[PDB]
Amino acid sequence: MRECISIHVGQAGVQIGNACWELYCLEHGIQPDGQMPSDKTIGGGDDSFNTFFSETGAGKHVPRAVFVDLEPTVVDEVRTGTYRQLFHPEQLITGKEDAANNYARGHYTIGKEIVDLVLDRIRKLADLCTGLQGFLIFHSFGGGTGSGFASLLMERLSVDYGKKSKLEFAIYPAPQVSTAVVEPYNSILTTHTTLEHSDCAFMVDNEAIYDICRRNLDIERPTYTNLNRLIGQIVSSITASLRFDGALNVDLTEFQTNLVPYPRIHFPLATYAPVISAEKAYHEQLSVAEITNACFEPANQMVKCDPRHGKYMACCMLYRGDVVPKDVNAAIATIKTKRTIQFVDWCPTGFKVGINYQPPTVVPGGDLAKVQRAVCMLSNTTAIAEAWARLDHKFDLMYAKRAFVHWYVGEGMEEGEFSEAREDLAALEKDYEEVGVD
C-alpha cells in the first residue's frame, strides 16, 4: 500500500528521529505504551499508522524507522528515554567505535562488518511491508558518523534496489561556521560518491533556522529541540499528503519527476511560510495570499542564498489545511506576472501544488503558531552555485597546502579520490552556469 521506511544515521540523525517520531505519535494519539485506549483501532495493522507504524496483533505500534550510529551514548539515553518501549531494541543500531569525522573510517574500517547487520534489518523490514515507496534518509554532510557510513549503505541500497525512490535530508555545511575543518574534506567525498545514485537531496542550514527564530518566533534563546520541531514539522507536512488526503493527492514520485530538470543536480530548497509566534498570530489573520509572498521573501529561506543572484527553476507548495483553489489560483496568477521573480524561460510552468484539508496541529509544550493554512515551499534555483563556489575556494587552498591527510593516508587512502571529486564539483558549476545560460 502507501508506506515507506525511514533511516536515521549518525547522532546528528538520531535526535531528529526522536523528535519527529515524538511528533507523529501525537496527531495519531499514540500513548507511550504503544496501545490506544479502549477505543478500537487495532487489527492486522491497517489504519492511520499502517504507513508509519506497525501495530500488529500485539496491539502496539512499531515505527518503520531504523536508528543507526557508531556510539552507544546517545542511543542508550534514548533507549532509556521516554518512547523506548515502542522502539525496537536492535532497530536502534548502535556502534562501539567512531569514524572521528573521517569519511573513510566510517566507510572502510567498521562499515563492512556492520552493514550486513543493517542489511538484515532492511530486508526484514522490506519483506513485511507491501508498498514500500521509498526511504527517508536523515544525515549530515559534515557527518562525524553521518557522512561516511551513509555513503556506503546508500551505495548498497542503490545496487540491490534501484527500482524505488530514496529520500535524503542533511544539514548543509554552514556558509561561515565550521565546527570542524575536516568537515570540508568529507563533504565532497560524500557528494561525489552520491551524485551518481542519489535521487533528490534536500538541505537546510542551522544559522538561518535561528535567524528566522529570533526574527519572527521572537526566541533569542531557542532550544536544540526547537530546530528539530521545525524540521520535524517540515517532514510532517510533506508526509501529511501520505497520511491524509485533500483536493489532490501527490506522491514522492511526482515530486521526483516534476522537480529535478536533468540528472546530477537534484538539490531543491524547502521553506515553511507560517512561521510566527503564537502571540503574533493571536491578533493577526493569515490567508494563502500573504503567506505565498512570505515564502517567496528571500530572508525566509534557511539557505544563505540571494535568489536575485540566481534564477528560478522549480517550485512546490503544499497547502495543508482549509484552502480553496479560487484565491490560490488568482494569487499564483499574480506571482507569475511578477517581474522580480526570475524563472528560467525554459519552463513556462514550474510549480507543483498540493492541497490537504488537515490543519497542522500544535505540539504540546511547543513554541510554534496556530496554523490552519500552511505550506512547505519546495523550490530549486540557480543561486545555489555560490555555495559550492563558496566551498571550492575553501578547498583548493587546503588541498594545495595539503592538510590532515596524514590522518587519512595514515589509515589507508590516497589523493586520487580527493582529486576526482574536484572536477566532479567543477563539473557541477559549469553544469550550473550552462543551465543558467539560456
Binding site: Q15, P72, T73, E97, D98, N101, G144, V177, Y224, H406
Partner: protein, 427 residues
C-alpha cells in the same frame, strides 16, 4: 566499550595523580573508604571508563603508581584515598634515585621495566578495549623522566593503536632548582616528540601567578595547585564520562587539533576563576565566561601567545548552556581578532558543549591551546643547553653511566629542527 588506564610517574605525578584521583572520587560520590554512596545514576553508569568493579560496590582505580622512594609512596598510601589504591600497582625500586636521567633510563629501569611491563599488561587484559593511556610526569623531573621515556618507548610498539597522552609540567623558567634539569629536559623531550601523540605543558610560575591573580590567598599549598590542575585535567575528561550533544573522543578531538605529526605540545585553558567576594559579585553569563576563558591573564600553561599567533583552538564547555551563545561568541571572537589567527587556516575553532555541570558550579569550561608561544620555551632551554654544553659542566657523572655527548648533539638538533619547524609554519 572503550576505557582508559592511568600511569602515575615521577615524584610530581605522585602528587599530581593523588589529587587527580581524589577529585574524581569526590566528583563521583564515593567515600574515601570506597563504598560508593549512590547519588547520580549517570556517574553510576559511565564510571567503567576509568574504574573496574570490586566486591561490595568498590570501584578499583585502573591507575599504576611507579617510583623508587617509599616515603613518597608512604605519604601517598597514608593519604585520604590510599585505601582505594591497591598494593598490587605499588611497584618500585630498592635504589635511591639521585634523579640522574641516565640511571633511571639505563641502570635502574632495566630491572624495573620488566615488572611494570608485566604489571600494565595484566590490567590491560583485565579490561576489554582501551581508547589509550595517559601519563602524569615532568619533563624536567628527575626520576619520572627516566621511567616515562623508557615506558613510552615500549608501549609504542606493543600497542601502536591507542592514545599516548602525556601530561608533563614545565619547570620554572627563572629557576630550575635542579641545575642539571636542562640536561634532563633536553634529554627527555628528544624521545618525547616521536613517541607521544599528545602533550600538555604546565608551568608553576603561571600557576603561582594565578594565586597572585584570582585565588588571592597569598600562601597556598602545592596541593592547592594540584587541585587547580586536576580540575583542568578532569574537565577535558568530563567529555568521555558524561553524555550530551558533544563529541568526546580524543581521536574525534586529536585529528581536529593536529594538522601535522610534529604537533604534540598543547596548552590548557580554564573557565571561571573567582576571588574572595566576587562569587556573589559575578553575574554568571556566557559572555563573561568567554571573556574570562579567553584572557591572557587566565592563561596558565607557558606564557602569552601575544608574541605569536593562534594555530588551533579547542574549548569544551560544561554546564546548562546552548549552541547559540558559543556560536555568536565564536562570531564575535572571530570578528574580534581575525588577524591574530593565521591565514593558513580559518575556522580553527572546535567547540564542545557538556550539559552536565560540575560539582560546585554550573557554568564552566576547559580550553586547550595550540599557538606560537613555545618558541620562547625551547629557545630558553637552547641557550641553557648551549651554555652548559659549551664547557660540558656536570658531565663526568653522565659519562660514568656510559652516556656520550653525541647523544646531546643529535638530540639538540632535533629540538633545533622543531625551532624551525614551528617558525617556518607560522613565521
Amino acid at each position: 566499550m572503550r576505557e582508559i588506564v592511568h600511569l602515575q610517574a615521577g615524584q610530581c605525578g605522585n602528587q599530581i595523580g593523588a589529587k587527580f584521583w581524589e577529585v574524581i572520587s569526590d566528583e563521583h560520590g564515593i567515600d574515601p573508604t570506597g563504598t560508593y554512596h549512590g547519588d547520580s545514576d549517570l556517574q553510576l553508569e559511565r564510571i567503567n571508563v576509568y574504574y573496574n568493579e570490586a566486591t561490595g560496590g568498590k570501584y578499583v582505580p585502573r591507575a599504576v603508581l611507579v617510583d623508587l622512594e617509599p616515603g613518597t609512596m608512604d605519604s601517598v598510601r597514608s593519604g585520604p584515598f590510599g585505601q582505594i589504591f591497591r598494593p598490587d600497582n605499588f611497584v618500585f625500586g630498592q635504589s635511591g634515585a639521585g634523579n640522574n636521567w641516565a640511571k633511571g633510563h639505563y641502570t635502574e629501569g632495566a630491572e624495573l621495566v620488566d615488572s611494570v611491563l608485566d604489571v600494565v599488561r595484566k590490567e590491560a587484559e583485565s579490561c576489554d578495549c582501551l581508547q589509550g593511556f595517559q601519563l602524569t610526569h615532568s619533563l624536567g623531573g628527575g626520576t619520572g623522566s627516566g621511567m616515562g621515556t623508557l615506558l613510552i618507548s615500549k608501549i609504542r610498539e606493543e600497542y601502536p593503536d591507542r592514545i599516548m597522552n602525556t601530561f608533563s609540567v614545565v619547570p620554572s623558567p627563572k629557576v630550575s632548582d635542579t641545575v642539571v634539569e636542562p640536561y634532563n629536559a633536553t634529554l627527555s623531550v628528544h624521545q618525547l616528540v616521536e613517541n607521544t601523540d599528545e602533550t600538555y605543558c604546565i608551568d608553576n610560575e603561571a600557576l603561582y601567578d594565578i594565586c597572585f591573580r584570582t585565588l588571592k590567598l597569598t600562601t597556598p599549598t602545592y596541593g592547592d595547585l594540584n587541585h587547580l590542575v586536576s580540575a583542568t585535567m578532569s574537565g577535558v575528561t568530563t567529555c568521555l564520562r558524561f553524555p550530551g550533544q558533544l563529541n568526546a573522543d580524543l581521536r574525534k578531538l586529536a585529528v581536529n587539533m593536529v594538522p601535522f605529526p610534529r604537533l604534540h605540545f598543547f596548552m590548557p585553558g580554564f573557565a571561571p576563576l573567582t576571588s574572595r567576594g566576587s562569587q556573589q559579585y559575578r553575574a554568571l553569563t556566557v559572555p563573561e565566561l568567554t571573556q574570562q576563558m579567553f584572557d591572557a591573564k587566565n592563561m596558565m600553561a607557558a606564557c602569552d601567545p601575544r608574541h605569536g599567533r593562534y594555530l588551533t583552538v579547542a574549548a569544551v564547555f560544561r554546564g546548562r548552556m546552548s549552541m547559540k551563545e558559543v556560536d555568536e561568541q565564536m562570531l564575535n571572537v572571530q570578528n574580534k581578532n581575525s588577524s591574530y589567527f593565521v591565514e593558513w587556516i580559518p575556522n580553527n575553532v572546535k567547540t564542545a558543549v557538556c550539559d552536565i555541570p560540575p560539582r560546585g558550579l554550573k557554568m564552566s569550561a576547559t580550553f586547550i591551546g595550540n599557538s606560537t608561544a613555545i618558541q620562547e620555551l625551547f629557545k630558553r632551554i637552547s641557550e641553557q643547553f648551549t651554555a652548559m654544553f659549551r664547557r660540558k659542566a656536570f658531565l663526568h657523572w653522565y659519562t660514568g653511566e656510559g652516556m656520550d655527548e653525541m647523544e646531546f648533539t643529535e638530540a639538540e638538533s632535533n629540538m633545533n629542527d622543531l625551532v624551525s619547524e614551528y617558525q617556518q609554519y607560522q613565521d
